[PDB]
Amino acid sequence: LHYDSLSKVGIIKGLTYNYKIKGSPSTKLMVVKLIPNIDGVRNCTQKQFDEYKNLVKNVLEPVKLALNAMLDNVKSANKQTLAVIDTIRGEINNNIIPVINQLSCDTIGLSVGIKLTQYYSEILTAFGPALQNPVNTRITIQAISSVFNRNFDELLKIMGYTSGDLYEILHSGLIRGNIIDVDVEAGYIALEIEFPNLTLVPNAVVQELMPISYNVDGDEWVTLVPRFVLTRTTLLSNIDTSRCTVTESSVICDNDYALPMSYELIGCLQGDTSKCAREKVVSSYVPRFALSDGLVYANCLNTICRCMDTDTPISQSLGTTVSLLDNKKCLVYQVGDILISVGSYLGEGEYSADNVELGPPVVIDKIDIGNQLAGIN
Amino acid sequence: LHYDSLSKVGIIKGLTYNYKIKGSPSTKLMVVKLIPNIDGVRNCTQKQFDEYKNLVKNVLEPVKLALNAMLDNVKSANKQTLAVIDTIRGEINNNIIPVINQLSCDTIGLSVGIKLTQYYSEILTAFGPALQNPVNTRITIQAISSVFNRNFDELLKIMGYTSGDLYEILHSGLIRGNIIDVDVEAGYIALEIEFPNLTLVPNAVVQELMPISYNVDGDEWVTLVPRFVLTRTTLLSNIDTSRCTVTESSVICDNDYALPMSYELIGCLQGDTSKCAREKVVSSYVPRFALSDGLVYANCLNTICRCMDTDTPISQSLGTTVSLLDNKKCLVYQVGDILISVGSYLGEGEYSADNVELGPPVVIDKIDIGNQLAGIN
Amino acid sequence: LHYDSLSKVGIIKGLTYNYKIKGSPSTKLMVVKLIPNIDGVRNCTQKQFDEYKNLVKNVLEPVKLALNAMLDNVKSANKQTLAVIDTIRGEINNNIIPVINQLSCDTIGLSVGIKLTQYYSEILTAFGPALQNPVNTRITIQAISSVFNRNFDELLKIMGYTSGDLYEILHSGLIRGNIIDVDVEAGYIALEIEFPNLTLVPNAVVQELMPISYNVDGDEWVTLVPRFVLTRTTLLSNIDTSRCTVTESSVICDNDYALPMSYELIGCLQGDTSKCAREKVVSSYVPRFALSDGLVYANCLNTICRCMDTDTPISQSLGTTVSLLDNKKCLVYQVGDILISVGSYLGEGEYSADNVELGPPVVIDKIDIGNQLAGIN
Ligand SMILES: *[C@@H]1O[C@H](CO)[C@@H](O)[C@H](O)[C@H]1NC(C)=O
Ligand SMILES: *[C@@H]1O[C@H](CO)[C@@H](O)[C@H](O)[C@H]1NC(C)=O
Ligand SMILES: *[C@@H]1O[C@H](CO)[C@@H](O)[C@H](O)[C@H]1NC(C)=O
Ligand SMILES: *[C@@H]1O[C@H](CO)[C@@H](O)[C@H](O)[C@H]1NC(C)=O
Ligand SMILES: *[C@@H]1O[C@H](CO)[C@@H](O)[C@H](O)[C@H]1NC(C)=O
Ligand SMILES: *[C@@H]1O[C@H](CO)[C@@H](O)[C@H](O)[C@H]1NC(C)=O
């Protein structure tokens, strides 16, 4: 593939991708427990533990019901003084002490209630999607690290992934899973996770071609070539990416979609330019620009191009039909009737809670009558 | 494009979309803090604050680990009486008071614990996806309003969006972001958000064409035209939408996919009908109906059509090969062997909590012995 | 369609799918209330209820703002002794009792605060997506069971779904919804849910064809056929699935994409093999294998095939151009320069909380001076 001789034919070099073939996934089963084991002094904590269980039931019961509906489709003077003293003792012993003791277990109960609530939130974060959609979920990073015991070296080694594969796999969301079974009373869900096996085709590189209009002897012409062509070593072939997943780094296809390329097209791509079926534009709309990673290419030889906020027209020095516009002059270009903006940077911000100041507890002072008793003795 | 003369050829007018070209996104960085600054009487709150920190660590550590694995891919008698009194004072001063004072800080601790838990839930709602999937997330509306300080007029002004663009952008989910870095101990994540720059092509309208079978001199025929044709002013061109995002209002493509249209096709679309490559149907299955926004069009001149629950056959008055069925007669139509239902309305419902009634607190009465002391004095 | 005679031409039978046409969805409106009705002793609970309301406001206000921005686009000695006794009574009555009574309502307040927090978490689980993305969300299973009162028999009956439809609908995520209106002060959102109406085309089966290279008289050849062909009874037609949703069980298309098939292709598919436009491979890359549900087919007659970890070469007995490799011998195959792995099983694991042990409450002993009073009397 020779680009220098295609540029003058109106074909602009586009993005480059590697080429991978997707095979059957590896499977790993994980059981997620929603109700923690809390034991000891059950009579003290009981009330908060039961409300928690109802939260879990309300979340899991709809999963069980859906799985049953789909059962066939799921894959798997001294006397008076003493009387006063005893009366006071009575009120302390019958009212004050019993209340304080009850408050001590209300406190433990609430502490457990908070701890349980946070545990649910941790699960909601990691296995949220699993609970929300029993079929075909996207697996989170927290769920993955749990699966491999927080060891990504082991993850890569077992799957045979490079750092580049982990990145594009997470980008596309190719790690998926399903709930196969649940136990509502126990608070258990059985989640099955599928980890894809990707294979790299050696030296196979996919090259995008972006044709735009150009002028020649007269009139306006467009050259017609496949948008995507596959090059390996010295071989060229046609591909169809409409059924493939495309990431920034590679094209991931199930099966191998390469097909034989015609002689005439091979000729053009390699620099012949003898044929390159160019077609005359008479009563059709055709493109006059192409965009690649922020670069703007345009046929400013045919149409009127302008740089905004400099109020300056754009022209060509000839020797080419396609010019690259310089992004260092302005943010907005006009090509024909279309205004093209660029990806400028906006200032940094933050999200946070307001600062919180706590006040002191109410503290009861000690009762000290030593100075009075001393004067009675 | 002249529809009246295409109807008699078996081509039914379909949906209409505008046409837009997607360029490089604008970038804005936001730092999200998961641990709030709570200060004052640290000895009182400490215990609940530490459990919260462990929740945050369990959520963020897997993000840090994944980012490191992907480091190369991430973009960025009086004496006895006194003895009794002092004994009672002792039990109050050594047992009752110390317990009450401890309960006062247990209460403050629990209050902080609840407040912290709710803060996490707010973050889980707005930045949930960011934490779950470090690469290529969909940005929530809460995260967006945070970015623009709850001012959507500013949002639209900076990006150059109309209300129609904000709607279709949220519909498709074109606002994306990534975590670039984290600090597990600090509880910080650095989230980068990409806001797309869409440009409108003036007067460019995409029109869907839906061919069905029809009869003529004899036998059964189907006319073959591209499903999508692009019309601007007086110009027609071919497009390929298999690589574009399609919303209810518009087709959003990266780069411009328009290509020159052949003379013969232009002729047909504009009403010539001289060629319109019609092909004979001999041993193939072909469509006899078309659906558009609930409208059902059918070739009831060729096949048998019926209106269900009226038990009434459907017929044509001729003068056309395509008839539109009236949705005011029945909900289910039969065309040939296929039963076609319509989008009926189901009754309104609600989701809510059961009403909760609270009981009163236990209240300790005051100790009043004034009437007894008065009789001793 | 006759496969035995296509195998020798290099065409391998692929996956089989049913064929369905998607029509207008049924609509059901549900109102979700985020603030529960808690009443009684309002002076005791008030403080925690107000903090909860602020959580709800922070989540809903951005939804209201977005809806307003999009308003035009949204679809809808004895005396001294008595003095000591009264002094002690004073400290109990003025310090100890008031504090204990306050702790009793602090306890009720905290209990309500926990209960409210959990309710929000339940909503975040079921209607999370609705709050996060006001436009075009995926509906969760919890939201669906709420809509049908936890009765999936009613769900299937009303929609006319079979268990197979519920499964593939949840798999693809075809149940969608939008927030049409909100009330921030009331804590209400109005969520509209669209349930798709799918219709099955009788006997319509889509068959995938996977061509690979083969040898014949000499040189290397590839036969070119459409990847997907539609067969009904005795009729064959061409389809285009690039615009359709594909599930494991079926192809779900809006409208009907079948078009007439050419005579020559019908001939080949039915076993003629007279034409089958076979093309010579001269300077192109072509596939030498095909993958289907873990099965690996390969042209080991043309290239070199090996079984890894057995260190054994793979050969053919002839009588065929395509051989199926046996997955019971090894996990990794080499075909040409490409290493193909298989979906092996990884061991079962679990996610859970550490077991928690609770200690006892602090219990205040009763004050017993009966033995001393008895010696004074
Ligand atoms: C727990 O409460 C029950 C009454 O529901 C009581 O019978 C039992 O003895 C209590 N157990 C303890 C250890 O307090
Ligand atoms: C008061 O008298 C009691 C008699 O038992 C004695 O124990 C106590 O220490 C005396 N208090 C003072 C201040 O002398
Ligand atoms: C906090 O607790 C520590 C013991 O862990 C103690 O040394 C310190 O004095 C306490 N500070 C306050 C203000 O109570
Ligand atoms: C009881 O006697 C004490 C002596 O100090 C006095 O202060 C108190 O008011 C008297 N109480 C009554 C009810 O007379
Ligand atoms: C509630 O508190 C207010 C003061 O904010 C007070 O006026 C009112 O009487 C109290 N009501 C009850 C039932 O305690
Ligand atoms: C002490 O004397 C009082 C006088 O009212 C009497 O009620 C109480 O029972 C006596 N206590 C004992 C242990 O005798």
Author numbering:
A (entry chain A), B (entry chain C), C (entry chain B): 23 to 98, 159 to 459
Reproduce the article's own wording on this structure.
Langya virus (LayV) was recently found in shrews and isolated from febrile patients in China, representing the first human-infecting HNV from shrew origin. HNV infections are facilitated by the attachment glycoprotein (G) and the fusion glycoprotein (F). Upon G-mediated receptor engagement, F is triggered and promotes membrane fusion and viral entry. LayV F and G are closely related to MojV F and G but distantly related to their NiV and HeV counterparts.
To understand the molecular basis of 4G5 binding to LayV F, we determined a cryoEM structure of 4G5 Fab-bound postfusion F at 3.5 Å resolution. Local refinements of the 4G5-bound membrane-proximal region and of the membrane-distal base yielded reconstructions at 3.4 and 3.2 Å, respectively. EM analysis of negatively stained samples revealed binding of one 4G5 Fab to prefusion F and of three Fabs to postfusion F. Postfusion LayV F forms a ~150 Å-high and ~70 Å-wide conical trimer with a prominent triple helical bundle assembled from the central helices and HR1, surrounded by three antiparallel HR2 helices yielding a 6-helix bundle at one end of the trimer. The opposite end of the molecule forms a triangular base. Glycans at positions N65 and N459 are resolved at the periphery of the elongated trimer. Although F refolding affects a large fraction of the trimer, the N-terminus, the β-rich domains comprising residues 281 to 420, and the upstream helix remain mostly unchanged, besides modification of their relative orientations.
